[PDB]
Design an enzyme around this catalytic site. Structure first.
Site, PDB file in Angstrom:
ATOM      1  N   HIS B  41      17.042  69.043  39.420  1.00  0.00           N
ATOM      2  CA  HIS B  41      17.943  69.140  40.581  1.00  0.00           C
ATOM      3  C   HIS B  41      18.541  70.686  40.628  1.00  0.00           C
ATOM      4  O   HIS B  41      19.687  70.849  41.828  1.00  0.00           O
ATOM      5  CB  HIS B  41      19.198  68.412  39.651  1.00  0.00           C
ATOM      6  CG  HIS B  41      19.975  68.584  38.693  1.00  0.00           C
ATOM      7  ND1 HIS B  41      20.441  68.621  37.271  1.00  0.00           N
ATOM      8  CD2 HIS B  41      20.296  70.503  39.113  1.00  0.00           C
ATOM      9  CE1 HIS B  41      20.484  69.242  37.151  1.00  0.00           C
ATOM     10  NE2 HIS B  41      21.008  70.082  37.417  1.00  0.00           N
ATOM     11  N   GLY B 143      27.709  75.077  35.327  1.00  0.00           N
ATOM     12  CA  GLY B 143      26.543  75.995  35.730  1.00  0.00           C
ATOM     13  C   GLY B 143      26.016  76.057  34.332  1.00  0.00           C
ATOM     14  O   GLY B 143      24.461  76.754  34.650  1.00  0.00           O
ATOM     15  N   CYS B 145      23.514  73.794  33.397  1.00  0.00           N
ATOM     16  CA  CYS B 145      22.960  73.123  33.485  1.00  0.00           C
ATOM     17  C   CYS B 145      21.250  74.065  32.802  1.00  0.00           C
ATOM     18  O   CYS B 145      21.293  75.378  33.424  1.00  0.00           O
ATOM     19  CB  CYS B 145      22.106  72.215  34.444  1.00  0.00           C
ATOM     20  SG  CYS B 145      23.338  70.542  34.749  1.00  0.00           S
TER      21      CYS B 145
HETATM   22  C1  NEN Z   1      24.436  73.205  36.778  1.00  0.00           C
HETATM   23  C2  NEN Z   1      24.314  71.458  35.702  1.00  0.00           C
HETATM   24  C3  NEN Z   1      24.626  70.824  37.059  1.00  0.00           C
HETATM   25  O1  NEN Z   1      25.253  69.382  36.886  1.00  0.00           O
HETATM   26  N1  NEN Z   1      25.168  71.232  37.916  1.00  0.00           N
HETATM   27  C4  NEN Z   1      25.485  70.959  39.472  1.00  0.00           C
HETATM   28  C5  NEN Z   1      24.674  71.646  41.084  1.00  0.00           C
HETATM   29  C6  NEN Z   1      25.126  72.379  38.332  1.00  0.00           C
HETATM   30  O2  NEN Z   1      24.589  73.367  39.385  1.00  0.00           O
END
Ligand code: NEN
Ligand code: NEN
Ligand code: NEN
Ligand code: NEN
Lengths: 306, 306
Positions: B41, B143, B145
């Site tokens: 994503h 942030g 992820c």
């Molecule tokens: C980290 C995980 C998530 O869902 N996002 C939003 C785009 C991040 O940037």
């Protein structure tokens, strides 16, 4: 979101841990620049530890009686001296992985990470708090002495604790990196009593603010108390008294959540007299005092380090 | 002695964390050899995340739309491909600090450490358990992820988890390093329900053994039950049923403490029906299921790593 008892990343500390042997005693040491720091009871035998005369014991030792290994690399000891309860061993090599660092003497209630080590090798990492009676409730087995506690400020390590001993009561005592014990303990195997352990009120308060931030608000009540009258209740339950510096430290948590410090105090007041009645707060059935206001702010804003 | 929710030392993982940007989305990636692993994503925009067609989105992207930074060093992307829910970016440099490592798909109830990261930089480390419903109860902000979970076996890292999303309920979901989600979750912003979360019985049992080892024995009672009749009580309180493999895993804890598994089960039985009545066990007012039998043995014998 969520809330976890988080420790600092330990990478910068792993590369400083060495194994120190003197005689048949082996423990951990901290290698920064060209000095190795370790507990001076490394020079004790099993019999010596009841009534150790450290100066007289240190006289019988010479540089070559001290073996320092950093992994497979041997270090050579060139000088040695005793500073309070730590030994300083000057070696021939400066640690290449020496991080930017500082020695700091923390105050009761501050938190730090412990890197528990054996034979100079890292075993695991956990967060804890210096109790008001200058002990820590850690997890240490035989051989873990010289394990250190530390904070990280961006790219800088602040060493604040070196592990020296377990009390007959199962709690843990040690020094700063200049070798002064936290608390009235000595490095001998005799009965030593810690004082009454109390709860760190300002930390509990910071944790209530964390819980409000994360969706737990059942304990919020419509009451407003005074500092005197809260502290009067606080002292009854073995809670540290709250002062104005404590209220000032909580200011930003107050501002971000719209709840005044005194109002939060009134909620705590009620939990102390009535209990939590089966309910939980951020997963816990007890009030938690191992997060400082800074910890909560760090966690809830995602502060990072080099 | 003592007992702490301990994490693995994170040094070997810190040196693998990079920052991945594509468009305006930035998250964390894992750099091993000459491949960077990250959530796919990353190629989504804010609007794309409700109904993302990942193949169609991945078509509009070329190697130079992906910026990978390892600290201040820029990596150049030479190839890119999608494996399930992760992107694999082939870069021009092999990570010098690549540790010996393996990818592993863990099972519910196993534990691991999480290195929570932001912008490719390490923020903190905590231990947690894969719940029976394939979620974790972590601590993640926007942030985070691409933060990973891992175990260490002597000198070998076992990556088992990559963080992908927070559910509307505040719990966390992600994949293994081959990109297969743990659980029935998809990487889209829609309502997704986790199942009933249950308690990991074999871990609770391991923790009771830890507590006996550390001096807490008030809950030991003089009763002996059967597996069927314990499980009949277990299911009533949303506890995972106990099987024979579970009893076998506890054998060494049984042997070191002289208490049979079935007898320990009978003690737990009573706590479930009667409660802990204000008392505590290893500091906690709740039964704790985030230590596996292996964790307890490791902690109580001081296993170390390179
Ligand atoms: C980290 C995980 C998530 O869902 N996002 C939003 C785009 C991040 O940037
Ligand atoms: C980190 C590096 C250093 O020398 N300092 C001075 C106080 C730090 O804070
Ligand atoms: C660690 C290093 C490696 O390649 N392995 C194989 C299973 C490990 O366990
Ligand atoms: C580690 C700390 C301690 O008291 N000992 C016994 C000599 C160690 O080796």
């Amino acid at each position: 979101s969520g809330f976890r008892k988080m420790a600092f990343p330990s990478g910068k500390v792993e590369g400083c841990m060495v194994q120190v042997t003197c005689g048949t005693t082996t423990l951990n040491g901290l290698w920064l620049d060209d000095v190795v720091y370790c507990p001076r009871h490394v020079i004790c035998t099993s019999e010596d530890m009841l009534n150790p005369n450290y100066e007289d014991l240190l006289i019988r030792k010479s540089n070559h009686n001290f073996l320092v290994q950093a992994g497979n690399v041997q270090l050579r000891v060139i000088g040695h001296s005793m500073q309070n309860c730590v030994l300083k061993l000057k070696v021939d090599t400066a640690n290449p992985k020496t991080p930017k660092y500082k020695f700091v003497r923390i105050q009761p209630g501050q938190t730090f990470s412990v890197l528990a080590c054996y034979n100079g090798s890292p075993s695991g990492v956990y967060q804890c708090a210096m109790r008001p009676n200058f002990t820590i409730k850690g997890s240490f087995l035989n051989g873990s002495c010289g394990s250190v506690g530390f904070n990280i400020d961006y790219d800088c390590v602040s060493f604040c604790y070196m592990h020296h001993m377990e009390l007959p009561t199962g709690v843990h005592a040690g020094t700063d990196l200049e070798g002064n014990f936290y608390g009235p303990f000595v490095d001998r195997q005799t009965a030593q009593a810690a004082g009454t352990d109390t709860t760190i009120t300002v930390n509990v308060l910071a944790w209530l603010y964390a819980a409000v931030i994360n969706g737990d608000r059942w304990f919020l009540n419509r009451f407003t108390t005074t500092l005197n009258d809260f502290n009067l209740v606080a002292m009854k339950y073995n809670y540290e008294p709250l002062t104005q510096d404590h209220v000032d430290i909580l200011g930003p948590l107050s501002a971000q959540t719209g709840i005044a410090v005194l109002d939060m105090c009134a909620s705590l007041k009620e939990l102390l007299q009535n209990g939590m009645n089966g309910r939980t707060i951020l997963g816990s059935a007890l009030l938690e005092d191992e997060f400082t206001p800074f910890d909560v702010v760090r966690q809830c804003s995602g502060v990072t380090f080099q």
